RNA sequence: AUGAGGAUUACCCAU
RNA sequence: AUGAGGAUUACCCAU
RNA sequence: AUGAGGAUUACCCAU
RNA sequence: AUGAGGAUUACCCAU
């Protein structure tokens, strides 16, 4: 066992899938990056700290790039037109059992399931109404 | 007893379970992540330290993704809308024996057991009433 | 009722029990140690005193060795990695009768009884949840 | 009963065993030393105090010497090339029953058992990985 | 998945091989050390970091000891008569793809291959001629 | 007899192999450069010198270019989009015999062997984890 | 009271 | 440039 | 002489 | 510690 393994970030049904792999663990921050130049890579980081005497806090971040080729000084460089950033913070009391935590995971999964309000809004450049 | 191993975080009874596996150990801070992009993964980190002369403190952090209307592998912004954060901090006096600690763990499991108030509130998007 | 005597600290049901026996009485501070080097022994000390005009206070300290991967009689450094420390301080008002005190002892036994939260937490390297 | 008795600190299977014996109890500090010149002896000390109103703290220390013969001013003296020090502090709430304490002892014993992670690392001049 | 593992630093067939094992990863600096006396051990450290806006930089260090015994006052200690210090810094622009990096590694391996100028000059206390 | 000769820096089988050839040896600094445009060439320099009374020190440098064509005003020139810079210093006491040096070289070759931590971390835009 | 602070005449140190 | 000048990280020194 | 200091006409910087 | 605060070298900002 070791949960620090590679995984499929973007699932495009076996073709053009974006898989992310472990790349660094310096300073207690777990990092995963897609197989690209550091300038065009997808990035995922995770860290856990004992925020309070009775809380533990997970800090998760994802970076989705819009890859492009830019000409600088007459030369072509692999670059990122822009990046989308996801920053999530999860605070869990120390009294939460494993089953209480499994509940939290399922909630986050249900939150983003296809067809549900939120992902439907995001995917359509809309708000909730 | 090497305890840094893979384990079931969200138990949906064999089918659709969420397994979290070791992914980083930088700075004695153990990390576990699910097989997802880091922006949509379930993340768990844990570390222990002597907070003061009389106490030891465990800091546990968990991150859970919102799943409803989630687009697997997609770029979902703002991050704060798609993630839940749990920060647990457990303070244990240096006088606590293994038995004392086992009792402390039971208190945590009981706090989160199915049907008890706290988890029933969280799950129903409610408070106490 | 001379109570300074040998007694079973860790009960593993007759076989593999850890007995602790009187080893020092300097300064009215009773001490008990297991039959080990002092760096790997189970140690227990107890003393009572009038903390203030209205209270009496018992100070109980226990030391427990980390046993997993322990080398009997070997030199294990750093000390702080191989030992657990328990500091108990019990304050009892001078008005407490023997009955009141018996009740206080039951509260302590109940707090640590098998299956209750606190010991269940400690034993599972967890907090409350 | 009196737990202040001699015991085998280093077990080398009946031959070359390092047994330690009671040597002092001044100032509430129980001391044991191996049968050597005070300059080359193994030393073990234990003391218990009521650290807080509700905690008891055991302070245990072991000293493992590397014996050598040094020539000073043209004369040979029994000496110690260097010493390894183990300092452990154990804090136990006053609410811990005897069985809760037996749990603590077993934990420390399991922690150092041959073959387990920690003693395996120490014995090999390595870290955990 | 982890690359912070044990590995062979010096390959002498399969007998006399020098192996370094992880020992510590504090402050983003990974450290490996060979077994036995830390005083006579081989050391290797590695760290990575964003030096500037477009460059990541690796700092790798190796220490080769000259194993010897020091005798002073008739007291002998295992020591290193002296040490050889290899210190290298590698800068890589964030535009480097994995292919580009693989090339950079082959350049380093080729630079030190048996028979080539640099490695054979060093192996003979010589310079270029 | 001479070691200031041509050699293979990058080994790609036998086709696409990068070869550097001597170019200049002024001021005790030996320099090798690959053929074609100096602008897109691989560079290697090496020098040795008595740093202190007991230490000799080698300073080796390698430059890996990213071959590209720059177009400005419709005028294209062969250039390097950027360069990777390897800079290493090796210190060796004057007490090192040829055997000691050979060991130091094997340590360097082992440090970069395929499959080992450092070389595989670099080859993947990653760090240690 | 806390330190994955240092040492070794049950001792210094920081907060 | 010279020294039957001195030393030893291809270096000081006198004229 | 040291830097997990920065770069890239064997070069700058801090101590 | 809190922000339906801002960004993107695990970083600034207000309270």
mmCIF file of N, CA, C and O in Angstrom, chain E residues 5-91:
data_model
loop_
_atom_site.group_PDB
_atom_site.id
_atom_site.type_symbol
_atom_site.label_atom_id
_atom_site.label_comp_id
_atom_site.label_asym_id
_atom_site.label_seq_id
_atom_site.Cartn_x
_atom_site.Cartn_y
_atom_site.Cartn_z
ATOM 1 N N UNK E 5 13.863 5.789 -2.501
ATOM 2 C CA UNK E 5 14.186 4.449 -2.065
ATOM 3 C C UNK E 5 15.671 4.156 -2.063
ATOM 4 O O UNK E 5 16.501 4.973 -2.457
ATOM 5 N N UNK E 6 15.985 2.956 -1.608
ATOM 6 C CA UNK E 6 17.344 2.480 -1.533
ATOM 7 C C UNK E 6 17.857 2.231 -2.948
ATOM 8 O O UNK E 6 17.071 1.990 -3.865
ATOM 9 N N UNK E 7 19.169 2.318 -3.140
ATOM 10 C CA UNK E 7 19.748 2.070 -4.452
ATOM 11 C C UNK E 7 21.254 1.907 -4.343
ATOM 12 O O UNK E 7 21.856 2.292 -3.334
ATOM 13 N N UNK E 8 21.855 1.324 -5.374
ATOM 14 C CA UNK E 8 23.292 1.092 -5.375
ATOM 15 C C UNK E 8 24.077 2.292 -5.878
ATOM 16 O O UNK E 8 23.949 2.684 -7.043
ATOM 17 N N UNK E 9 24.899 2.870 -5.007
ATOM 18 C CA UNK E 9 25.712 4.016 -5.391
ATOM 19 C C UNK E 9 26.979 3.523 -6.078
ATOM 20 O O UNK E 9 27.346 4.014 -7.142
ATOM 21 N N UNK E 10 27.648 2.556 -5.461
ATOM 22 C CA UNK E 10 28.866 2.001 -6.040
ATOM 23 C C UNK E 10 28.625 0.542 -6.383
ATOM 24 O O UNK E 10 28.296 -0.272 -5.517
ATOM 25 N N UNK E 11 28.788 0.216 -7.658
ATOM 26 C CA UNK E 11 28.577 -1.140 -8.126
ATOM 27 C C UNK E 11 29.899 -1.885 -8.275
ATOM 28 O O UNK E 11 30.689 -1.604 -9.183
ATOM 29 N N UNK E 12 30.142 -2.827 -7.369
ATOM 30 C CA UNK E 12 31.361 -3.630 -7.408
ATOM 31 C C UNK E 12 31.003 -5.080 -7.711
ATOM 32 O O UNK E 12 31.430 -6.001 -7.018
ATOM 33 N N UNK E 13 30.212 -5.276 -8.757
ATOM 34 C CA UNK E 13 29.801 -6.617 -9.126
ATOM 35 C C UNK E 13 28.526 -6.996 -8.405
ATOM 36 O O UNK E 13 27.429 -6.922 -8.961
ATOM 37 N N UNK E 14 28.667 -7.401 -7.151
ATOM 38 C CA UNK E 14 27.517 -7.784 -6.350
ATOM 39 C C UNK E 14 28.027 -8.051 -4.952
ATOM 40 O O UNK E 14 27.294 -8.486 -4.060
ATOM 41 N N UNK E 15 29.315 -7.779 -4.781
ATOM 42 C CA UNK E 15 29.998 -7.975 -3.515
ATOM 43 C C UNK E 15 30.885 -6.759 -3.242
ATOM 44 O O UNK E 15 31.862 -6.500 -3.956
ATOM 45 N N UNK E 16 30.535 -6.015 -2.200
ATOM 46 C CA UNK E 16 31.285 -4.820 -1.867
ATOM 47 C C UNK E 16 30.545 -3.634 -2.453
ATOM 48 O O UNK E 16 31.061 -2.514 -2.477
ATOM 49 N N UNK E 17 29.334 -3.898 -2.946
ATOM 50 C CA UNK E 17 28.494 -2.861 -3.527
ATOM 51 C C UNK E 17 28.122 -1.903 -2.418
ATOM 52 O O UNK E 17 27.804 -2.331 -1.311
ATOM 53 N N UNK E 18 28.171 -0.608 -2.701
ATOM 54 C CA UNK E 18 27.792 0.364 -1.694
ATOM 55 C C UNK E 18 26.346 0.747 -1.950
ATOM 56 O O UNK E 18 25.972 1.139 -3.056
ATOM 57 N N UNK E 19 25.528 0.607 -0.921
ATOM 58 C CA UNK E 19 24.127 0.930 -1.035
ATOM 59 C C UNK E 19 23.750 2.039 -0.079
ATOM 60 O O UNK E 19 24.103 2.002 1.105
ATOM 61 N N UNK E 20 23.039 3.033 -0.596
ATOM 62 C CA UNK E 20 22.582 4.124 0.241
ATOM 63 C C UNK E 20 21.079 3.908 0.438
ATOM 64 O O UNK E 20 20.394 3.427 -0.470
ATOM 65 N N UNK E 21 20.582 4.232 1.629
ATOM 66 C CA UNK E 21 19.172 4.066 1.946
ATOM 67 C C UNK E 21 18.596 5.385 2.424
ATOM 68 O O UNK E 21 19.288 6.170 3.074
ATOM 69 N N UNK E 22 17.316 5.652 2.113
ATOM 70 C CA UNK E 22 16.712 6.912 2.555
ATOM 71 C C UNK E 22 16.934 7.116 4.046
ATOM 72 O O UNK E 22 16.939 6.156 4.808
ATOM 73 N N UNK E 23 17.133 8.358 4.469
ATOM 74 C CA UNK E 23 17.321 8.612 5.885
ATOM 75 C C UNK E 23 16.508 9.808 6.360
ATOM 76 O O UNK E 23 16.042 9.832 7.496
ATOM 77 N N UNK E 24 16.312 10.795 5.499
ATOM 78 C CA UNK E 24 15.574 11.964 5.925
ATOM 79 C C UNK E 24 15.160 12.836 4.742
ATOM 80 O O UNK E 24 15.874 12.921 3.746
ATOM 81 N N UNK E 25 13.995 13.469 4.846
ATOM 82 C CA UNK E 25 13.483 14.314 3.773
ATOM 83 C C UNK E 25 12.896 15.611 4.325
ATOM 84 O O UNK E 25 11.782 15.996 3.975
ATOM 85 N N UNK E 26 13.647 16.288 5.183
ATOM 86 C CA UNK E 26 13.188 17.539 5.771
ATOM 87 C C UNK E 26 13.542 18.745 4.902
ATOM 88 O O UNK E 26 14.597 18.781 4.265
ATOM 89 N N UNK E 27 12.645 19.726 4.884
ATOM 90 C CA UNK E 27 12.841 20.955 4.113
ATOM 91 C C UNK E 27 13.120 20.743 2.631
ATOM 92 O O UNK E 27 13.998 21.388 2.062
ATOM 93 N N UNK E 28 12.380 19.837 2.011
ATOM 94 C CA UNK E 28 12.578 19.594 0.595
ATOM 95 C C UNK E 28 13.932 19.045 0.195
ATOM 96 O O UNK E 28 14.266 19.062 -0.985
ATOM 97 N N UNK E 29 14.723 18.563 1.151
ATOM 98 C CA UNK E 29 16.025 17.989 0.815
ATOM 99 C C UNK E 29 16.060 16.496 1.138
ATOM 100 O O UNK E 29 16.093 16.107 2.305
ATOM 101 N N UNK E 30 16.041 15.666 0.096
ATOM 102 C CA UNK E 30 16.069 14.217 0.264
ATOM 103 C C UNK E 30 17.493 13.776 0.570
ATOM 104 O O UNK E 30 18.426 14.211 -0.096
ATOM 105 N N UNK E 31 17.658 12.912 1.573
ATOM 106 C CA UNK E 31 18.981 12.426 1.956
ATOM 107 C C UNK E 31 19.075 10.904 2.051
ATOM 108 O O UNK E 31 18.211 10.254 2.642
ATOM 109 N N UNK E 32 20.137 10.354 1.467
ATOM 110 C CA UNK E 32 20.399 8.919 1.484
ATOM 111 C C UNK E 32 21.752 8.708 2.185
ATOM 112 O O UNK E 32 22.676 9.514 2.011
ATOM 113 N N UNK E 33 21.870 7.628 2.959
ATOM 114 C CA UNK E 33 23.107 7.311 3.683
ATOM 115 C C UNK E 33 23.355 5.801 3.675
ATOM 116 O O UNK E 33 22.415 5.016 3.777
ATOM 117 N N UNK E 34 24.617 5.395 3.569
ATOM 118 C CA UNK E 34 24.944 3.975 3.576
ATOM 119 C C UNK E 34 24.890 3.491 5.029
ATOM 120 O O UNK E 34 24.952 4.300 5.959
ATOM 121 N N UNK E 35 24.774 2.179 5.220
ATOM 122 C CA UNK E 35 24.688 1.615 6.560
ATOM 123 C C UNK E 35 25.990 1.727 7.370
ATOM 124 O O UNK E 35 27.028 2.149 6.851
ATOM 125 N N UNK E 36 25.907 1.344 8.648
ATOM 126 C CA UNK E 36 27.014 1.411 9.608
ATOM 127 C C UNK E 36 27.359 2.841 10.032
ATOM 128 O O UNK E 36 26.687 3.786 9.633
ATOM 129 N N UNK E 37 28.397 2.992 10.851
ATOM 130 C CA UNK E 37 28.803 4.302 11.363
ATOM 131 C C UNK E 37 28.512 5.470 10.443
ATOM 132 O O UNK E 37 29.026 5.531 9.326
ATOM 133 N N UNK E 38 27.683 6.396 10.916
ATOM 134 C CA UNK E 38 27.346 7.580 10.142
ATOM 135 C C UNK E 38 28.668 8.275 9.810
ATOM 136 O O UNK E 38 28.822 8.875 8.743
ATOM 137 N N UNK E 39 29.634 8.155 10.718
ATOM 138 C CA UNK E 39 30.943 8.772 10.548
ATOM 139 C C UNK E 39 31.696 8.297 9.308
ATOM 140 O O UNK E 39 32.480 9.055 8.738
ATOM 141 N N UNK E 40 31.466 7.057 8.887
ATOM 142 C CA UNK E 40 32.146 6.505 7.712
ATOM 143 C C UNK E 40 31.186 6.260 6.553
ATOM 144 O O UNK E 40 31.526 5.566 5.593
ATOM 145 N N UNK E 41 29.993 6.837 6.642
ATOM 146 C CA UNK E 41 28.963 6.628 5.633
ATOM 147 C C UNK E 41 29.030 7.476 4.375
ATOM 148 O O UNK E 41 29.582 8.580 4.368
ATOM 149 N N UNK E 42 28.460 6.930 3.302
ATOM 150 C CA UNK E 42 28.370 7.629 2.033
ATOM 151 C C UNK E 42 27.104 8.470 2.146
ATOM 152 O O UNK E 42 26.098 8.020 2.698
ATOM 153 N N UNK E 43 27.145 9.688 1.626
ATOM 154 C CA UNK E 43 25.982 10.544 1.710
ATOM 155 C C UNK E 43 25.592 11.075 0.335
ATOM 156 O O UNK E 43 26.445 11.336 -0.521
ATOM 157 N N UNK E 44 24.289 11.213 0.132
ATOM 158 C CA UNK E 44 23.750 11.720 -1.119
ATOM 159 C C UNK E 44 22.534 12.552 -0.775
ATOM 160 O O UNK E 44 21.678 12.109 -0.002
ATOM 161 N N UNK E 45 22.457 13.759 -1.323
ATOM 162 C CA UNK E 45 21.300 14.599 -1.078
ATOM 163 C C UNK E 45 20.854 15.192 -2.403
ATOM 164 O O UNK E 45 21.665 15.403 -3.304
ATOM 165 N N UNK E 46 19.555 15.432 -2.522
ATOM 166 C CA UNK E 46 18.994 15.975 -3.742
ATOM 167 C C UNK E 46 17.792 16.842 -3.416
ATOM 168 O O UNK E 46 17.016 16.521 -2.518
ATOM 169 N N UNK E 47 17.652 17.953 -4.129
ATOM 170 C CA UNK E 47 16.517 18.840 -3.930
ATOM 171 C C UNK E 47 16.255 19.530 -5.263
ATOM 172 O O UNK E 47 17.143 19.603 -6.116
ATOM 173 N N UNK E 48 15.033 20.015 -5.452
ATOM 174 C CA UNK E 48 14.651 20.686 -6.691
ATOM 175 C C UNK E 48 13.876 21.919 -6.317
ATOM 176 O O UNK E 48 13.211 21.947 -5.283
ATOM 177 N N UNK E 49 13.935 22.939 -7.157
ATOM 178 C CA UNK E 49 13.189 24.141 -6.863
ATOM 179 C C UNK E 49 13.166 25.131 -8.013
ATOM 180 O O UNK E 49 14.030 25.120 -8.883
ATOM 181 N N UNK E 50 12.138 25.967 -8.014
ATOM 182 C CA UNK E 50 11.949 26.982 -9.034
ATOM 183 C C UNK E 50 12.937 28.108 -8.737
ATOM 184 O O UNK E 50 12.674 28.971 -7.904
ATOM 185 N N UNK E 51 14.081 28.093 -9.410
ATOM 186 C CA UNK E 51 15.091 29.119 -9.188
ATOM 187 C C UNK E 51 14.618 30.481 -9.686
ATOM 188 O O UNK E 51 14.759 31.486 -8.989
ATOM 189 N N UNK E 52 14.063 30.518 -10.895
ATOM 190 C CA UNK E 52 13.552 31.765 -11.451
ATOM 191 C C UNK E 52 12.195 31.478 -12.078
ATOM 192 O O UNK E 52 11.637 30.391 -11.893
ATOM 193 N N UNK E 53 11.664 32.439 -12.820
ATOM 194 C CA UNK E 53 10.351 32.266 -13.434
ATOM 195 C C UNK E 53 10.289 31.185 -14.504
ATOM 196 O O UNK E 53 9.238 30.578 -14.706
ATOM 197 N N UNK E 54 11.408 30.934 -15.180
ATOM 198 C CA UNK E 54 11.426 29.941 -16.248
ATOM 199 C C UNK E 54 12.373 28.781 -16.021
ATOM 200 O O UNK E 54 12.493 27.904 -16.872
ATOM 201 N N UNK E 55 13.039 28.764 -14.873
ATOM 202 C CA UNK E 55 13.970 27.687 -14.601
ATOM 203 C C UNK E 55 13.754 26.938 -13.311
ATOM 204 O O UNK E 55 13.476 27.531 -12.274
ATOM 205 N N UNK E 56 13.877 25.619 -13.396
ATOM 206 C CA UNK E 56 13.797 24.768 -12.225
ATOM 207 C C UNK E 56 15.257 24.369 -12.056
ATOM 208 O O UNK E 56 15.994 24.271 -13.040
ATOM 209 N N UNK E 57 15.689 24.142 -10.825
ATOM 210 C CA UNK E 57 17.084 23.811 -10.604
ATOM 211 C C UNK E 57 17.301 22.688 -9.608
ATOM 212 O O UNK E 57 16.760 22.714 -8.509
ATOM 213 N N UNK E 58 18.095 21.698 -10.004
ATOM 214 C CA UNK E 58 18.404 20.575 -9.134
ATOM 215 C C UNK E 58 19.757 20.801 -8.485
ATOM 216 O O UNK E 58 20.678 21.305 -9.126
ATOM 217 N N UNK E 59 19.869 20.439 -7.209
ATOM 218 C CA UNK E 59 21.132 20.541 -6.486
ATOM 219 C C UNK E 59 21.378 19.156 -5.899
ATOM 220 O O UNK E 59 20.665 18.713 -5.002
ATOM 221 N N UNK E 60 22.380 18.470 -6.429
ATOM 222 C CA UNK E 60 22.717 17.125 -5.998
ATOM 223 C C UNK E 60 24.092 17.128 -5.352
ATOM 224 O O UNK E 60 24.996 17.833 -5.799
ATOM 225 N N UNK E 61 24.256 16.342 -4.295
ATOM 226 C CA UNK E 61 25.528 16.289 -3.595
ATOM 227 C C UNK E 61 25.879 14.885 -3.172
ATOM 228 O O UNK E 61 25.030 14.134 -2.708
ATOM 229 N N UNK E 62 27.142 14.528 -3.329
ATOM 230 C CA UNK E 62 27.587 13.207 -2.943
ATOM 231 C C UNK E 62 28.871 13.324 -2.128
ATOM 232 O O UNK E 62 29.694 14.212 -2.363
ATOM 233 N N UNK E 63 29.026 12.427 -1.163
ATOM 234 C CA UNK E 63 30.208 12.402 -0.319
ATOM 235 C C UNK E 63 30.809 11.007 -0.311
ATOM 236 O O UNK E 63 30.139 10.039 0.045
ATOM 237 N N UNK E 64 32.065 10.902 -0.732
ATOM 238 C CA UNK E 64 32.742 9.613 -0.744
ATOM 239 C C UNK E 64 33.770 9.669 0.366
ATOM 240 O O UNK E 64 34.661 10.518 0.361
ATOM 241 N N UNK E 65 33.650 8.767 1.347
ATOM 242 C CA UNK E 65 34.595 8.764 2.459
ATOM 243 C C UNK E 65 35.769 7.821 2.299
ATOM 244 O O UNK E 65 35.711 6.839 1.554
ATOM 245 N N UNK E 66 36.837 8.141 3.017
ATOM 246 C CA UNK E 66 38.024 7.318 3.034
ATOM 247 C C UNK E 66 37.965 6.677 4.413
ATOM 248 O O UNK E 66 38.324 7.294 5.417
ATOM 249 N N UNK E 67 37.477 5.446 4.463
ATOM 250 C CA UNK E 67 37.332 4.729 5.724
ATOM 251 C C UNK E 67 38.643 4.475 6.466
ATOM 252 O O UNK E 67 39.592 3.914 5.917
ATOM 253 N N UNK E 68 38.686 4.883 7.727
ATOM 254 C CA UNK E 68 39.881 4.696 8.534
ATOM 255 C C UNK E 68 39.534 4.657 10.016
ATOM 256 O O UNK E 68 38.442 5.059 10.419
ATOM 257 N N UNK E 69 40.469 4.171 10.821
ATOM 258 C CA UNK E 69 40.287 4.085 12.262
ATOM 259 C C UNK E 69 41.157 5.129 12.945
ATOM 260 O O UNK E 69 42.363 5.186 12.703
ATOM 261 N N UNK E 70 40.565 5.956 13.797
ATOM 262 C CA UNK E 70 41.356 6.959 14.497
ATOM 263 C C UNK E 70 41.662 6.495 15.904
ATOM 264 O O UNK E 70 40.764 6.077 16.636
ATOM 265 N N UNK E 71 42.933 6.558 16.280
ATOM 266 C CA UNK E 71 43.329 6.163 17.627
ATOM 267 C C UNK E 71 43.894 7.358 18.369
ATOM 268 O O UNK E 71 44.861 7.982 17.930
ATOM 269 N N UNK E 72 43.269 7.685 19.490
ATOM 270 C CA UNK E 72 43.703 8.800 20.311
ATOM 271 C C UNK E 72 43.581 8.411 21.781
ATOM 272 O O UNK E 72 42.487 8.103 22.269
ATOM 273 N N UNK E 73 44.714 8.421 22.482
ATOM 274 C CA UNK E 73 44.711 8.053 23.881
ATOM 275 C C UNK E 73 44.443 6.570 24.023
ATOM 276 O O UNK E 73 44.054 6.099 25.087
ATOM 277 N N UNK E 74 44.650 5.820 22.948
ATOM 278 C CA UNK E 74 44.408 4.393 23.016
ATOM 279 C C UNK E 74 42.945 4.066 22.793
ATOM 280 O O UNK E 74 42.538 2.910 22.897
ATOM 281 N N UNK E 75 42.156 5.094 22.489
ATOM 282 C CA UNK E 75 40.728 4.944 22.229
ATOM 283 C C UNK E 75 40.518 5.038 20.721
ATOM 284 O O UNK E 75 40.742 6.100 20.139
ATOM 285 N N UNK E 76 40.104 3.950 20.076
ATOM 286 C CA UNK E 76 39.878 4.026 18.635
ATOM 287 C C UNK E 76 38.415 4.197 18.235
ATOM 288 O O UNK E 76 37.513 3.593 18.817
ATOM 289 N N UNK E 77 38.200 5.049 17.237
ATOM 290 C CA UNK E 77 36.869 5.345 16.726
ATOM 291 C C UNK E 77 36.841 5.174 15.217
ATOM 292 O O UNK E 77 37.835 5.426 14.537
ATOM 293 N N UNK E 78 35.700 4.739 14.671
ATOM 294 C CA UNK E 78 35.598 4.564 13.221
ATOM 295 C C UNK E 78 35.413 5.968 12.661
ATOM 296 O O UNK E 78 34.521 6.704 13.106
ATOM 297 N N UNK E 79 36.260 6.357 11.713
ATOM 298 C CA UNK E 79 36.146 7.691 11.136
ATOM 299 C C UNK E 79 36.452 7.681 9.649
ATOM 300 O O UNK E 79 36.711 6.630 9.053
ATOM 301 N N UNK E 80 36.394 8.866 9.054
ATOM 302 C CA UNK E 80 36.720 9.038 7.653
ATOM 303 C C UNK E 80 38.000 9.883 7.681
ATOM 304 O O UNK E 80 38.005 10.996 8.220
ATOM 305 N N UNK E 81 39.092 9.338 7.148
ATOM 306 C CA UNK E 81 40.364 10.056 7.113
ATOM 307 C C UNK E 81 40.149 11.386 6.392
ATOM 308 O O UNK E 81 40.763 12.400 6.726
ATOM 309 N N UNK E 82 39.268 11.363 5.399
ATOM 310 C CA UNK E 82 38.909 12.539 4.620
ATOM 311 C C UNK E 82 37.737 12.160 3.730
ATOM 312 O O UNK E 82 37.336 10.991 3.675
ATOM 313 N N UNK E 83 37.191 13.148 3.036
ATOM 314 C CA UNK E 83 36.056 12.915 2.153
ATOM 315 C C UNK E 83 36.218 13.644 0.834
ATOM 316 O O UNK E 83 36.836 14.718 0.767
ATOM 317 N N UNK E 84 35.660 13.051 -0.209
ATOM 318 C CA UNK E 84 35.681 13.644 -1.536
ATOM 319 C C UNK E 84 34.284 14.250 -1.677
ATOM 320 O O UNK E 84 33.296 13.603 -1.320
ATOM 321 N N UNK E 85 34.186 15.481 -2.173
ATOM 322 C CA UNK E 85 32.873 16.120 -2.293
ATOM 323 C C UNK E 85 32.417 16.470 -3.701
ATOM 324 O O UNK E 85 32.996 17.336 -4.354
ATOM 325 N N UNK E 86 31.362 15.809 -4.160
ATOM 326 C CA UNK E 86 30.821 16.093 -5.479
ATOM 327 C C UNK E 86 29.623 16.983 -5.280
ATOM 328 O O UNK E 86 28.711 16.641 -4.527
ATOM 329 N N UNK E 87 29.627 18.125 -5.954
ATOM 330 C CA UNK E 87 28.531 19.073 -5.847
ATOM 331 C C UNK E 87 28.090 19.539 -7.242
ATOM 332 O O UNK E 87 28.851 20.203 -7.946
ATOM 333 N N UNK E 88 26.869 19.184 -7.646
ATOM 334 C CA UNK E 88 26.386 19.586 -8.959
ATOM 335 C C UNK E 88 25.022 20.257 -8.983
ATOM 336 O O UNK E 88 24.146 19.941 -8.194
ATOM 337 N N UNK E 89 24.868 21.202 -9.905
ATOM 338 C CA UNK E 89 23.634 21.946 -10.075
ATOM 339 C C UNK E 89 23.190 21.816 -11.512
ATOM 340 O O UNK E 89 23.974 22.032 -12.433
ATOM 341 N N UNK E 90 21.929 21.463 -11.704
ATOM 342 C CA UNK E 90 21.392 21.294 -13.040
ATOM 343 C C UNK E 90 20.202 22.221 -13.258
ATOM 344 O O UNK E 90 19.216 22.149 -12.525
ATOM 345 N N UNK E 91 20.290 23.098 -14.253
ATOM 346 C CA UNK E 91 19.200 24.025 -14.538
ATOM 347 C C UNK E 91 18.435 23.609 -15.777
ATOM 348 O O UNK E 91 19.030 23.386 -16.831
#
